[model samples]
Target: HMVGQLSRGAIAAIMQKGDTNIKPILQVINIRPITTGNSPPRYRLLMSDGLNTLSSFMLATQLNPLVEEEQLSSNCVCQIHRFIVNTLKDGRRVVILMELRVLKSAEAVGVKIGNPVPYNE
Candidate 1:
């Protein structure tokens, strides 16, 4: 979602509806460790669609280092390449991140765009 083409869909759209394998570029708000009894330690991402933002997105344990190399900082623009939504049996839709490709670095992106908020269920 770059320039004036952001109205289509973002992570919220993908999460609520569905998604194609095509990558969608989004901004990184932040990333942190999953702290609940969700039961393990891993990094979770906070992403922004420019129009909205969502958290609880994940990066594979091995991919955590991608945060730095990929420049997935506070305002980096990135394209998600491989991923899927995981619907747990107990009832939870989690984003299972398989891969990401950095589009623009935080140093280049400069600032966040639009006004972003979660698409609350």
Candidate 2:
């Protein structure tokens, strides 16, 4: 149950600078389902990169089972194995969580890693 360890500065690098050279390990601070038209609910995650927390993640439908089984939850740490940074019409970027590996479970960590502030870009 590793804690307080994250790839710092990854949030701005990926979302704002669009740097694709790095794969970041971030902590799942929060997750909730967003219901959209004609589709199943999408899982939105509030991920933290040690110093900052970004709330613009959308889990791919293929990985719904992870959440459904209660495997992915608050305080769980994960490595971003694969992802896509999509910029919406309003110029906001959404990090689509395509593939990931849970490194640590929520129950194991049991606490937030850092005093992270909201990330804005």
Candidate 3:
């Protein structure tokens, strides 16, 4: 499997816990490379939650990195759902995963639809 590497910031996003104030950690970590196998890859994150070490993991990973221009707003919500569903289906209590890609300047520009102008300017 070609599990893409995640940046430190992305990893931190996944480790966050609590309410919906922060982007749901589960939604961020759903991107995974596809493979042909009966069992899916699993992750285990060890962290202390008040008393004991809470284990967070994920199962049935799916990756949909590219969001269409029109779907960017709504697709985010859908991605969140996908993450939650996969996590629950695999019997994992918590999902700790994040997907982020750092693109080159040229690539970034190619995808850019428009540039924001500062109000002060």
| Top of the candidates by lDDT | 2
Please identify model 2 stretches exceeding 4 Å from their true place: 1-4
> Which residues of candidate 1, in runs, are more than 4 Å off?
1-8, 36-41, 68-70
Clashing pairs in 3: 29-97, 29-98
Give the winner by TM-score: 1 or 3: 1
lDDT of 1 by residue, 1-121 (tens): 3544333266756776677565777788788776667554678888877777777577776676776465567787777888878777887677777888777788887777667777663
Question: Model-by-model lDDT, in order?
Answer: 0.71, 0.88, 0.28
Off by over 4 Å in 3: 1-18, 23-37, 48-52, 59-92, 100-121
Clashing pairs in 2: none
TM per candidate comes to 0.78, 0.92, 0.25
| Predicted candidate 2 versus true structure: per-residue lDDT over 7-116, tens digit per residue | 98899899667887677999999999997988887999999998899999989999999999999899999998889888899988889988899989999889999788
The Cα error of candidate 1 at residue 93, in Å, is 1.3
